Design a protein around this ligand. Sequence first.
Ligand SMILES: CC(=O)SCCNC(=O)CCNC(=O)[C@H](O)C(C)(C)COP(=O)(O)OP(=O)(O)OC[C@H]1O[C@@H](n2cnc3c(N)ncnc32)[C@H](O)[C@@H]1OP(=O)(O)O
Ligand SMILES: [Zn+2]
Length: 246
Amino acid sequence: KNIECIELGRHRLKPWYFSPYPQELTTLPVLYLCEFCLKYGRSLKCLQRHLTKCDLRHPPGNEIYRKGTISFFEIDGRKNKSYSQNLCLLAKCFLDHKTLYYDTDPFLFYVMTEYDCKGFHIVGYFSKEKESTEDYNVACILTLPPYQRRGYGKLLIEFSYELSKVEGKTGTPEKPLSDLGLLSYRSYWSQTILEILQITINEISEITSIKKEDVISTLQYLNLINYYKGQYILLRIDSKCLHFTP
Ligand SMILES: CC(=O)SCCNC(=O)CCNC(=O)[C@H](O)C(C)(C)COP(=O)(O)OP(=O)(O)OC[C@H]1O[C@@H](n2cnc3c(N)ncnc32)[C@H](O)[C@@H]1OP(=O)(O)O
Ligand SMILES: [Zn+2]
């Protein structure tokens, strides 16, 4: 673990893990990040100078969802390489591993923001492989620490499933899940399935885009397993505001 402190807009962030930022930036008291383009540098003065030329004020890509103060921006990792590359460097501060951190081409990124009079503030994101042989509808998911324990993680997961629905597919997060990932998914899966509550798990899976194995591990967790004749038997996203084209 190499970076002790990150400043991102109004927040001080405390990394959990090593992230391969330039080695000369890993021995500083504070690594300064532009909160809009996620550019990193060695001092507050260069940041203030930067903020003078930095146009953005939100993430790149297209604003495919907006409801109240919450937006989602869809960002092609190939079309917006330096932003996505900067996002991955930050994300790795809170991820145990991040495979292919340096190559953002294979991925889409869904960045969730909170809007106020100062701009669109990055709250968290999830990535997704453009092509997955394993039907992984999320590769990495993150809520930045200042926003954690507030329902944002479950909102990101819900949005990931809304995308799968439009694609007419079931999806599942990339494995292995971190323990924080599993706690979040378990909670989202549980609330979704109870909300549905006779129905078959095939029907649950078709309605929610959740893989059957995930519905089963969840009913197991909820002590709601009922195996009958070969068969298992039992902050929100408004999908009208979603404008997504697979
Ligand atoms: C596929 C992958 O990427 S695996 C990688 C998973 N991501 C990471 O580990 C990155 C670091 N962690 C994070 O960014 C966050 O912890 C996330 C995204 C996993 C969860 O974000 P949050 O915004 O805190 O989630 P949210 O507030 O919606 O909580 C969801 C559920 O998880 C539980 N949870 C979240 N964090 C914790 C924690 N540290 N300890 C115990 N439970 C937790 C919540 O209590 C909630 O459960 P409940 O509905 O039963 O009350
Ligand atoms: Zn910037």
